[PDB]
């Protein structure tokens, strides 16, 4: 029986590969060859945000493109004012081992988690005036790797239990669990319409999930090592993944295939963070080389280098308005580039 | 609206000052405490050494014991709420003072599993500068097992038959020579891994431990002294 099911799985895999090859009319490079290159993108460290004591594992921009939350392994969740390099809040965490941090799109809430296997939501805009824990989501059997707010009262958390979860914050319950990954889910990125999200795990595969329906619509293979970063294209029709195989690949949902690969021969280190520009033309990738690379998403040609970090770049992300990209690294410093 | 903006600017500066003061206090507290990662197998006995400095010293997914020796604070971290995969959550512990690797010396079946686990920490890109305080635990069981003679290390480690106890060995007063040869063979497998790479940015401190052993807190203190003394040699340009 097991052999028959495995044979059926192989047949289905062959059919899927044949369909993908059938819809591969032309490569992205063959269509963007005539495109004028972006040129050398020179971005300087406008502001460095100092005050974290250990390595920064995560950071998330606010919707206003002005506030910013950062997580560090000293049990501190510092909310900066990027414009004025001022720290609005510094939240002490119950467990110092924090790997993810989230900023609610409406403000008023910041989430974090890690080896505690708990997603902790903190209420900022409170009547008491002091940040306190509002909810302690404890349903995961592994370490949280990425948390993202759909909105208030709803959050999607990826964990090291090979599953993602959709949480109802008021009741503190798993509205829907997303199973199907065979490895540690490392990062999820929300679609602009909030209706979908892709999760990249340690099984070298990225899966597009349906938030409301609750099953994996498509799987995306092509990476040959653990995916550590995922990010949607500004329209929810493509996403970029970064793995320890030193390659970024742009997968498109409608084609159910990889479009083009962002790799260099000199690059032999993993990719930690991935984010697009507001127009999707630039693919900023954080690296273990203590530096970041800007990729022309349509040409896979390196545009620039963001080299200002002494330790590995752990988090990366552009503002909502696309003005600046913040880069937090293991050297306990967060830098805003522009 | 410049006058209204000045008020919010001053309030933001005051908030920044308060955050700075709290961060300096937690800064001092953060240096004063040394962070230890506890690693091992299910049968390694890490909990016993976690308890023996929790019942004889200061003392959900992460088991934490805050023990103090010689007025120096130590934080131990037993990560037990996770899966068998540890290639992504082990990278959190690249700033720890040391890794307390506990090995069941008696269990020859899972010795290779411990040795492969030790290699991965030693050769990892993010842990290649973190010293390991190796704890060859359950030496009471190792002594009984060797005197019994039913199970032979040669089956699991064929190079044992040509191994001789080093001159540097310090056997216990009532220790059988068979135990001493068995004891230092297990240590030399881990030291062979440790001495293979790591340059000078990495050291392994091997200690023999039992469940009744009550000096492990002192051992970690002395090794952490040597770990931080070694860092200060480079950080103060002595080396």
């Amino acid at each position, epitope marked *: 029986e097991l052999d028959q099911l495995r044979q059926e799985a192989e047949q289905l895999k062959n059919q899927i590969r044949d369909a993908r090859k059938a819809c591969a009319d032309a490569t992205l490079s063959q269509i963007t060859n005539n495109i004028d290159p972006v040129g050398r993108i020179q971005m300087r460290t406008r502001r460095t945000l100092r005050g974290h004591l250990a390595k920064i594992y995560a950071m998330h921009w606010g919707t206003d493109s002005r506030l910013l939350v950062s997580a560090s392994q000293d049990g501190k969740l510092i909310i900066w004012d990027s414009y004025t390099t001022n720290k609005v809040h510094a939240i002490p965490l119950r467990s110092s081992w924090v790997m993810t941090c989230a900023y609610a799109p409406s403000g008023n809430y910041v989430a974090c988690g890690g080896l505690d296997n708990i997603c902790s939501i903190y209420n900022l805009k409170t009547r008491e005036g002091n940040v306190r824990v509002s909810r302690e989501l404890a349903g995961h059997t592994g370490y949280l790797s990425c948390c993202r707010f759909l909105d208030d009262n709803q959050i999607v958390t990826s964990s090291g239990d090979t599953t993602c979860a959709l949480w109802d914050i008021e009741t503190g319950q798993q509205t829907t669990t997303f199973t199907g990954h065979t*490895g540690d889910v490392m990062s999820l990125s929300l679609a602009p319409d909030t209706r979908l999200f892709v999760s990249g795990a340690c099984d070298a595969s990225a899966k597009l999930w349906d938030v409301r329906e609750g099953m994996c619509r498509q799987t995306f293979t092509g990476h*040959e090592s653990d995916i550590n970063a995922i990010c949607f294209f500004p329209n929810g029709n493509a996403f970029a993944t970064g793995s320890d195989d030193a390659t970024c690949r742009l997968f498109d949902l409608r084609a159910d295939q990889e479009l083009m690969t962002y790799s260099h021969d000199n690059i032999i280190c993993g990719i930690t963070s991935v984010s697009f520009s507001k127009s999707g033309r630039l693919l900023l990738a954080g690296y273990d080389d203590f530096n970041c690379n800007v990729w022309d998403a349509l040409k896979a040609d390196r545009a620039g280098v963001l080299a200002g970090h002494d330790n590995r770049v752990s988090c990366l992300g552009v503002t909502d308005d696309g003005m600046a990209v913040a880069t937090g690294s293991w050297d306990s410093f967060l830098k805003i580039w522009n | 609206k410049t006058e209204d903006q000045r008020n919010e600017e001053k309030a933001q500066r005051e908030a920044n000052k308060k955050i700075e003061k709290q961060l300096q206090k937690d800064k001092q507290v953060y240096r004063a405490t040394h962070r230890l990662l506890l690693l091992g197998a299910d049968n390694s006995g890490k909990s016993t050494i976690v308890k023996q400095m929790r019942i004889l010293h200061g003392g959900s997914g992460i088991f934490e014991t805050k023990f103090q020796v010689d007025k120096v604070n130590f934080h131990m971290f037993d990560v037990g709420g996770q899966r068998d995969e540890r*290639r992504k959550w082990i990278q959190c512990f690249n700033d720890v003072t040391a890794i307390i690797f506990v090995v069941d010396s008696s269990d020859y079946n899972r010795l290779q599993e411990a040795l*492969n686990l030790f290699k*991965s920490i030693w050769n990892n890109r993010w842990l290649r500068t973190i010293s390991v305080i190796l704890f060859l635990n359950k030496q009471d069981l190792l002594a009984e097992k060797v005197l019994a003679g039913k199970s032979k290390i040669e089956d699991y480690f064929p190079e044992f038959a040509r191994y001789t106890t080093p001159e540097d060995a310090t056997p216990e007063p009532g220790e059988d020579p068979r135990v001493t040869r068995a004891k230092y063979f297990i240590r030399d497998e881990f030291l062979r891994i440790s001495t293979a790479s790591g340059d000078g940015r990495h050291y392994c401190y091997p200690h023999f431990t039992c469940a009744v052993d009550t000096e492990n807190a002192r051992r970690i203190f002395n090794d952490c002294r040597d770990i931080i003394q070694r860092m200060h040699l480079r950080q103060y340009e002595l080396l």
Partner: nanobody
Amino acid sequence: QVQLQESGGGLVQPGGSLRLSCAASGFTFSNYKMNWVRQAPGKGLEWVSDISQSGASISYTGSVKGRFTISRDNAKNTLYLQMNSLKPEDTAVYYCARCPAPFTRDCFDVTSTTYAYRGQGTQVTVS
């Protein structure tokens, strides 16, 4: 898609010989340190041998030393394991696991219960 398909197992008398191949695909085979892992009936996963990115750095578990030879053919993307003088203790399902990351000196999770790149498995039954 990272696929590691192994073949060659079967029933062989004690003191027999089997060669276990591994048709590796979906990744640059020359950048990863391949391994051989066996799960005996009723026992946990046990690492048998590993080979570096090249033919050098061949290491074996104590039980298989002297009678198992690991080999790698990067041109054909094949990992081999020549087992001689098989003992009944060698009855297990042999998996060909690869490194999680390329060009690394560490094999963290290769004997894990659910590892991404280990292969379906091939059964050798010596009796």
